[PDB]
Structures are given as C-alpha cells and as structure tokens.
Amino acid sequence: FSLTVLRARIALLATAIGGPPPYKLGDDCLACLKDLKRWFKLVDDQQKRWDVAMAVAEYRILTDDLLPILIDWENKCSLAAKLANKAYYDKIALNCLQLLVLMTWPLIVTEQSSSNQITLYGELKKHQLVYKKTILSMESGKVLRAAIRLALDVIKIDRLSRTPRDNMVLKLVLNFFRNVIAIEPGEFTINTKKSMPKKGITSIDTLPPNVSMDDISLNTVISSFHKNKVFGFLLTLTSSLSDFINIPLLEIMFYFTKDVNQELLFPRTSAGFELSKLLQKEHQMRKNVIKHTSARHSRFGGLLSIQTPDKTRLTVSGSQALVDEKIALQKLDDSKKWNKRIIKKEGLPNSLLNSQTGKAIFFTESNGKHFKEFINNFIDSGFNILLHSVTNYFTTEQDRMVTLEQVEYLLFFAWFVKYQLLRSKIDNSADIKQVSEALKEVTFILVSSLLRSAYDLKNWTVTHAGMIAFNELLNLVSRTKAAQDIEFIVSRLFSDERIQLLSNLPKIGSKYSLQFMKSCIELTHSVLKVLEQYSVNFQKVQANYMTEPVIETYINFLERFRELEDDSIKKVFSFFHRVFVQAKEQALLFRFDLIILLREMLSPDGLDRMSRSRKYVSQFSDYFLARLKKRLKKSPAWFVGLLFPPLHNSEVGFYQRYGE
Amino acid sequence: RKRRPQVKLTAEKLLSDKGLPYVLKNAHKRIRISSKKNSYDNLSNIIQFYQLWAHELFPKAKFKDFMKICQTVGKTDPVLREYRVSLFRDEMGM
C-alpha cells in the first residue's frame, strides 16, 4: 500500500509541474520541484529504497517534462546573451539539473547493500540507459549546452573570488557529464539458487526496446560532445587550472576513453578495403573448415578399423578418417564424452577491468578525425598541469582512497601516457617533453607504493591498474633515453626490493583473467629491452625469470591462438627466442604443452597462411625439432622424462637440465 | 547402494605392461625423423605415440586432461620422482 501511494504522489507531481505544444510551468512549480528533490533524497540515502527514481522513470518525467524545461530555458538564455525575473528563471534550471545528476548517479551494489537495492538494480539499469538514449537524441542533445551554463555562471568570476557555496554548484554540474557517459549495460544476474537446466540463458541483451546498441554506444556520446561544442567547454575548464574541479574532471573526460584503443586512430571505399581483407580471411578459414567434411553426405557410412599396436581392431567411423590416419586418431580422441572441471573466477566502470582486445567501438570516420584532434588539443592545453594539480592530493590520504579512485585514476594516467608515446612514435610533430613531465620523483614513488600496497590486500583489479602504468614507465624511460640523468632516478630503484614483486606476479596470476596475464608479459618484455643498452646485470635479471611457473604462464597465453594477435604471439615467442642462444635454458621448455601448441600453430586451422606470423615461427619450430631430436637421442630416460615435471634432486638438476 | 567409482590414475596403473617398458623399447624403433619433411608431420608422429599409449592405457580421459593429471601427479606424488631418479642413476653408470 505504501508503494502505490508513492506512485500516486509521483503522478500528482507529474500533473502539477505542467506540460505541453510549448511546455508550461504550473503553479507552485518551485514548491513541487523542492518536494520531489526532498522525497528522492530521503528515499536514496536516509531510507535506501530506490523506488522514487523508478516512479519518475515510469512517468517518463525525465523525457516528457524535465528535458523540455532545459530546452525551453536554452532559447531564453540565448536571447538574453545576444540582446545586449532572470534570477527566478535561472534558479529553476538549478533544481532540474540537480535532479538529473541525482537520477543519473551510477548505482553500486555490494554485500552490505539490502535486498531492495539489488532487486531494483536490474530494473533501473535499463532506465539508466533510457535516460542517456533520449538525452543524446533530443535534437542534437542540446541539454549539455544548457548544462555548461550551470558551470560558466560560477566559473566566470575570479578563481580567488570563488564562493564557499557556489563551489558545490560546479561539482554538481560536472558530475552530470561523467554520470551520463558512464551509463553502460549491466549483467543478467542469473538466480543460481538451483542447478540450471540443460539450456543456458536465452538472451543476454539487457536493453529495453526503446534502447538500441546503436543509440547508446560511446560513438554517440562523442558525436554529441562534438555537435554540442562542449569540446570548447572541456578545453577552457582545463585552461584555467591556475581543487574541487579536479577529482570529478579526472573521470569526466576519462569515461569515454577508459577502454577505447588508440590503434583505431590511424589506419596504418576506404572502409571497404578492410572489408575485402576480412572477407578473404573468413573465406580462407571456411576453406580450411571444409577440408574435414566428407565429399558426400554424412550417412554414406565410412567405417574402418585401425590396426593399432597389439593388433587392436578399434572401430572408428567417418570417411574423413579414411583419408589420413591423423584424422582417424583425432576422431578417436574427441569421441570421448567425458570432460574435466576448469575453474574460473566490474565493481567499477567497465573498461580494461573487463574488456577483451576485440572490443573496439565502431567510430565514424569524421567522428574519429574529430576525436583525434580533441584529445591532442587537451594535451596541448592542460595535461601536465592537471596531473600536477592532483599530485599534491595524491600524496595525502593514501589509506582514505576508495577502490574506485585507483581504477578511475591509474587507468587514465596509463592510457594517456601510452597515447602520447604512440602518437610521438607514428609522427614526430609532437615533442617528448609533453609527457616527460610525469617523471617526477614523488609521483613515481607514490604510484609504486600504491602498486606494492595493492599486492598484499589481494586487490587484483587495483594491482592490474598499476601494471598498465608500470609498463609505460619503462616504455617512456626507453623513449627518453633513445631520443635524448633524469631517467636514472626513476629507473634505478628496482634493484633488490622491486625484483621480487615483478618476478612473483607471473608465477601466481596465471589463474586469473586474460588481461592480468597479458600485463606481466609486457612488463618482462619492456624490462628486458630497457636494460639491454647498459648490460644491474643482464645475466642476473634473466636468471630469476627462467622459472617453471613463468614458462607455464607464458605458454598458457599461447593456447588462445583463436584470438591472439600478431604482437601477442610475437612477444610470447620472442621471450623464448631471445633466450635460445643468449641464455641457453631450453631444458625447461620440454613440456608437451609447447609441442601441442606448436602443432596447432603450424596447422592451417591456426595461424593465417598469408600473414607474416607462421613463417618465422615455422622455421624456428623446425630448429626446435632438431634440438629436441638431438637432446632426446642422447638420453633414453628423457623420452619419458619429457612428460613428467623436473626433479628437485641435486645431481639430476644439473645432469638433465644442463647435460653435465 | 553406491555407484562403481570412476577409475583414476593410480600409481600401479602407471607401470602397466603397455606403458613405460613399451615406450622405452619402441622409442628407437617406432618414430622416424627427417628434417626435410614438414615439422608438423614430425610433431604429429611424435605425439601419436603418446596419444596411443594414453588411449590404450586410459581410454576414459582425453589427451589434455590425461597430461594435466599426469603433470599434477608428478609435481605432487614423490614416488614418480623417486622412480625417475632411480632410472637416471641406472643410466649414469654407462
């Protein structure tokens, strides 16, 4: 009975505000706006119900009433700003935007959260997408042009002349930008209280019919940003950095770039050439597929017996097996219906924290061109200044930072410092000094301390937020060394204290997500190349790398060849290639896991024949087989020792791993 | 009352007649090697021996599961390491 009364009040407020067909402000509009604000605030935190927002979304208040308020105020604001009760006509938009940011606030569910919040999270996440869907498509999304008025009114006055109260207005308006663009589809929380049936989840599309994946992607957000001029707003806000406009702004312009790769920026009928190439690749893989299918129908009945050792007469069907004995053996292998158990595992805005390499958001060519220059202009305007502004705050309240701050800060830092270096690599028009300002000693030691502290608390996500920056630390050290003593103080503290941390993560993180494993291989590849120009010892750092779990975690990445790219396979294979003659530690490489992956590599079903990956790999595997034959021919026990793991006995450790 | 338990890789089963003696005997007279041929054929021929040994020794489990279980047993059970040490000591005499 309480819920339907709440619905009655929401409907009563809906018909009290007014409507169209020009929208009309009803009597006591401010009073009803304040009443709605008070009710929503009371039910949000004081009572923790999350039901008033639901009723508002139901009456389509945000679309039918709230948006037209700002749209109707926009023309009056333009007329007043071009002509040359303004306070009453200005304060009306304040409450509307305060309501908008409150409803657009992301919803977080944890164990401490009550059942109502988790129950309504799945029913309100779709409405969250609805809000951003209707906002972006509302006549070029001009509501953001009205939003920036709620900031330029306060920022216009002198910064030293700021207001102890009006200062919260800037935070409230700024939160709206980061809230609207952080809206992403949620997860279908399957009810796992009982065993699931012989069929899985039917539909994973968490989108209401009014919401389409076309109209909610970050491409739409970036197009709306460009068409609403707010690029100038974001540039001018950063141009006047010289506190409260730093923490929100850290993620206001980061959300749409939290997971967008920089490779799509440069291509390296224009879109149709890649279309033709992809058609060629899929034609090749389909051609490889049909090599197994019989020339005739399945019911042709091709039966055979393999005269296997012991004169066995095992019967396996299939005319395909009559072509090759290997096909018959594979049909023998996959005939078994028994399988083992494979164990498996975002609380913060989804991104690298949960995005596979192929999740490249489609961009319009014009939109891509605009976004290419927008971020470059931001870097040329205020990048290092913004970093130095938050350097002081980062040095304090180390234990007072919620896990959201690390994931929203470290990813931003690493992504932009990586983008600057790749942009400088592709084109020389950008100086390295534009990113060289991040080599400050205090910033480096603080970020390293955060990375090491995240290890002991089992905060794997926060630690993965740190490796992505640690890779670019070594990359930038190399870039500023080759293109050149400031780099020494940043790249000499990893002598004894930091070697354990970098040499332990690969041995333990192999039982987690793919990206966690991908971080460590890049770390090792970068660290093996930064020190090559000075060699504290080349033969000593590599000694701690040649360990069996390290080889296991490197070879576990190779099993995903159906999705590994040229560089992903290149780094993994080059790690073993660079130690073939420089280290000569191939004895630990003698597990069957690498041999079966080599068989998969050279097989046409794996790597592409026309590409430039399988040729050098095939030649190196040809040499690998020669090494295997030479080492196996000299030890009969090594024929079966190749399968079993190595031993801890003293004499055999040098007898087998080194051959006396 | 209770189902027949599934057969697992017991230590005794690892020393079957069609096991270690068979592979040790046929290593030097089963697989031919030639670098002129494509490496894929050589690798497939090499893995053929282990696959047939696993199937005729344990037709229940597949290839990858069998090798993973064997690796875990070798890393865990020290009797396999003791046997490997004994064979290494025997081979050291020559």
Added chain:
Amino acid sequence: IWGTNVSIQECTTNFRNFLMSFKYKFRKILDEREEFINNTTDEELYYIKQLNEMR
C-alpha cells in the same frame, strides 16, 4: 577397412598406378575386341587425358 582384412594403403596404391600409365588398349583387349588396331583412342593414357580435361 573394418570387416574386410583389407589395407587402405594397398588399395590406394593400386588405384594410383591404375590412374596413369593405363591405356584404353587394355580395355580393347580385355573384351577380345577385334578392332584393336586403333592407336590414339587405345594406346593413349585415357585417364590422364580425362584428368587434363577436368583441369
């Protein structure tokens, strides 16, 4: 082949050596055909010509 005690390898080799080096003259003499004087239509590699036609 199961249930036959016949090796696939020997059958493949038999059909392979039957494909080329075979001439229609063998068929012409198999049926005791009197008009086996023809050379181009009999002594030529019939199956090789067929394979070339397919190519």
Added chain:
DNA sequence: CACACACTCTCCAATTCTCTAA
C-alpha cells in the same frame, strides 16, 4: 494397464581448499 523418456528429489565419494604439516 507398462515400457520408455523427461525430469524433479535427493546423496556419497572423488574433486577442490585453506589450517596446520615438513
């Protein structure tokens, strides 16, 4: 009717896990 199918109700030993082991 009853034999065969599909599936909810129900249940111990092999498979995983982290406290105490070497």
Added chain:
DNA sequence: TTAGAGAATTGGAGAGTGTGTTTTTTTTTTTTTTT
C-alpha cells in the same frame, strides 16, 4: 618453500512422480446444384 597430515563442497547415478501412447476417417447414404 615442500610432499603431506588435517577441514570443506557438490556432480553423477538413482529413487521417484507423472507421462504417452493404439486411435481412426476408408466406404455408403443422403442432400444438393448442374449437367
């Protein structure tokens, strides 16, 4: 850090409740509109 003694959980066979069939429209009258 290693080979080995302790907790803790849940999938694969089986007890069991309720199903699902076989199961049919021929041939023969009677009417009605065209032929």
